[PDB]
Design a protein around this ligand. Sequence first.
Ligand SMILES: Nc1nc2c([nH]c(=O)n2[C@H]2C[C@H](O)[C@@H](COP(=O)(O)O)O2)c(=O)[nH]1
Ligand SMILES: OC[C@H]1O[C@@](CO)(O[C@H]2O[C@H](CO)[C@@H](O)[C@H](O)[C@H]2O)[C@@H](O)[C@@H]1O
Ligand SMILES: [Mn+2]
Ligand code: NA
Length: 129
Amino acid sequence: MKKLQIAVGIIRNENNEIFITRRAADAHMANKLEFPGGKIEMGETPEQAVVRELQEEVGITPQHFSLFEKLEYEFPDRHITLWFWLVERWEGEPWGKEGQPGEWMSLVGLNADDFPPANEPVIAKLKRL
Ligand SMILES: Nc1nc2c([nH]c(=O)n2[C@H]2C[C@H](O)[C@@H](COP(=O)(O)O)O2)c(=O)[nH]1
Ligand SMILES: OC[C@H]1O[C@@](CO)(O[C@H]2O[C@H](CO)[C@@H](O)[C@H](O)[C@H]2O)[C@@H](O)[C@@H]1O
Ligand SMILES: [Mn+2]
Ligand code: NA
C-alpha cells in the first residue's frame, strides 16, 4: 500500500470564507471538494510543501500560517498523512491557476460529505472557530 505525506492549505479570508477547489473527475477522490495542496516531496519540509503547492494550484504564497491539524487516513488503496495548515495571510489572490474550479465558501456552510472522508474532523474543528 502506497504511503503519502500531503500538505494542504485552509485559506480563510476576513469574512470567514474558505477558498475551496474541486478535484478532477479522473483523480483519486474524484469530484470531491478539497483544500488546495499536494504531496510533500523528498528534500522539502511540510511548511515548504504547502507554500509550493498553493503557489502551483491557486497562485498565492501563504505566510505566517500554522498547523491546524495533522492526521492519518487509510483509504481503500493508499495511506496518507495530511498536514492541514491554516492560512490567514498570503500574497496574491487565489484562483483556478491549474484550470480547476475554485470558489470562496462560508465556513458555516461547509458539508463534510462534499470532501474526502479524511477531512471530517478538520471540517468539524473549523466550524468550532
Ligand atoms: N489536495 C488535497 N488532497 C486531499 C485532501 N483531503 C484528502 O484526503 N486528500 C488526499 C487526496 C489525494 O489522495 C491526496 C492529494 O494528492 P494530490 O492532491 O496530488 O492529488 O490527498 C484535501 O483536502 N486536499
Ligand atoms: O509551525 C507553525 C507555528 O510556528 C509559528 C512560530 O511558533 O510560526 C512559524 O512557522 C510558520 C510556518 O513556517 C511560519 O509561517 C511563521 O512565519 C513562523 O513564525 C507559529 O506561528 C505557528 O503556529
Ligand atoms: Mn493537489
Ligand atoms: Na498539486
